[PDB]
A = this chain, B = another copy of it.
C-alpha cells in the first residue's frame, strides 16, 4: 500500500472518461476528501458507478454541479435536483441499476467472474431493455438500456448480468493500519468494501491511521492486498441528510393499514420494511415479541430513532434517516446484504406499491415522465420465492382509480412476486396461478364494495373474517 499526504496527489492521474467507483450509501461513508480532490483535478467525462448521487451540495452531487460526470450507474438518484435536472434535461446519461445487482456485478469485477445469473429484474425493463439511459430534451429516449439474456434454472427465470470494474475506486473507510489493512464503521461500509476490490487502482481515504496490530487479524474488513493507495482525510463534516431524533417521553385509512400490517409480524422473524406504512407498522410490534429488522445498506437489527446524544452519521436506515441499532446487531457490505436478501434469507419483505397485478406483478419504481428516481433495492427484495412479500397501499388511487388489476399499467418491479395485499378496505392473498382471493374485509364494507374498487375479479375465502387491527 502506498501512503499519501495529499488527496490530489493520490487521484492526480485519473484520465478523462475513466470509469470510477465511488463508495457510500446516501451520504453515509462517502469519500468526501477524494471527491473534493477531483474538483481540483478537474478530470471530466467520467462514468461514475455509485449507488446514489449524494445530495445537490455534497457527495457525488459536487461532481455533478461541476459537470465532471457523463455517466451515472446507480440504483437510486433521488434528493438531487441538479441531478434529475441534468437527467431529465438530457445533460447526463444514467443507467438505473437494481442495487443488489449493482453490488454483485461490482463484486464479480474483483472476483474473476465475468458474468452471473440473478432473478432480480426479470420481467422488468432491466431484463427487457428500454430503460431510459439518456433523454433528448423530450420524454423521448435518446439512449435506451438493452435487454439482458434470459435463462431458466430449476424452473425459475434469471437474467445474465456482467461484471463491473473501474479504472479507479474512491472508497471511504474508518481506519487503516500502517500495513494498509482497512476496516469500516457501522453502516458506512455498504459499497465501499466491494468496490475496494474491483478497480485497477484503488484509493482509500481513512479517518484515522493506526499502527500494525491494532486490528485482530480475523477482523480486517479489507486486507491490505486490495488497498493500492491510502490517504488520511483532512476534513470530515459528518454531513447528515435526514435528522430523525426521538424524545424519551413518547390519518385513518393509513392508521388502519398500519395497524393491520403490524399483524404480519411473528416472533423471531427477519423482515425488511420499506419506507412509510411498513416501517411505521413495526412501531406496534408487541414488546414481548422480537423481530429482527434488516436494512439494505448493510444492517441487521435496527432499533428506534436515536435520542439526541445517539445520532451518528455512520448509522442510517435504507430511507437515509439517522437510526439506532438493538443489541446483537450486525453490519455487513452491500454485496453481502443483497446475497442475504437475494438468497431469500429474509422472512418478510413489506413495501408500498402503486399497482399490483392479479397474479402478483408489482409496480412501485417508475412513473414515465414524472417519477424516474430509480428502483433502489426494491427489485432484489421481491426476487425470491422463499421470501413472503406483502404490499401495503391504499385500495384505490386519486379519483377512485383501480390500483389492483389484471395487468399493471406502470413499469414492473417484478413478475408474480406479491404474496399478499393489504389495503384499508381488504386483505388479499395472492397466488401466481389461481390469482387473488379475499381473506379479510373491513367492518362496514361488502364484497360488492370491494368488487367495484378492484380492476379484476377475485375469489372469496369461505373463512373470510372482518379485517383485524392491533393497538394491542
Query: Which residues of A pack against B, CB within 8 Å?
Result: 104, 107-108, 110-120, 153-154, 156, 158, 162, 177-181, 183-186, 189, 197, 212-213, 215-221, 223-226, 270, 292, 294, 300-301, 325, 327-332, 338-346, 383-384
The interface residues of chain B lying within 8 Å CB-to-CB of A118 are 112-113
Are B330 and A212 touching (Cβ within 8 A)?
no
Report the minimal beta-carbon distance from A336 to chain B, rounded to whole angstroms. Answer: 9
Q: How far is the CA of A112 from the CA of B340 in the complex (A)?
A: 8
Q: Please determine whether A116 and B113 come into contact, CB atoms closer than 8 angstroms.
A: yes
Chain A, interface SS category: mixed
Q: How far is the CB of A454 from chain B (nearest CB, A)?
A: 32
Q: Quick one: which of B112, B120, B178, B329 contacts A342, CB cutoff 8 A?
A: B112
Q: With a CB–CB cut-off of 8 A, which chain B residues contact A221?
A: 218
Q: Are A197 and B107 in contact (CB under 8 A)?
A: no
Given contacts A181-B328, A183-B218, A217-B331, contact A292 B225 (CB under 8 A): yes
* B384:A112 contact, CB within 8 angstroms: yes
List 28 interface pairs A-B (beta carbons < 8 Å), by A numbering: A110-B343, A111-B339, A112-B118, A112-B120, A112-B339, A112-B341, A112-B343, A115-B116, A115-B153, A116-B117, A178-B328, A179-B327, A179-B328, A185-B218, A197-B339, A212-B328, A213-B328, A216-B219, A217-B301, A217-B331, A223-B330, A223-B332, A223-B340, A225-B270, A225-B292, A225-B294, A225-B345, A225-B346
Chain B residues with CB under 8 A of A119: 112
> A339: which B residues are within 8 A, CB to CB?
107, 110-112, 197
Best-buried of A112, A218, A331, A332 by chain B (most CB within 10 Å): A112
Known contacts: A225-B292, A300-B223. The answer to whether A217 contacts B329 by CB under 8 A is yes
Who on chain B is nearest to A200 by CB? B386
Q: How far is the CA of A57 from the CA of B122 in the complex (A)?
A: 49
A153 adjacent to B162 (CB under 8 Å) = yes
Query: What would 20 more interface pairs be, CB under 8 Å, given A112-B343, A113-B118?
Result: A104-B113, A110-B343, A111-B339, A112-B344, A114-B153, A114-B154, A115-B158, A116-B117, A153-B162, A197-B340, A197-B343, A213-B328, A217-B330, A217-B331, A220-B331, A223-B332, A223-B340, A224-B330, A225-B294, A226-B345
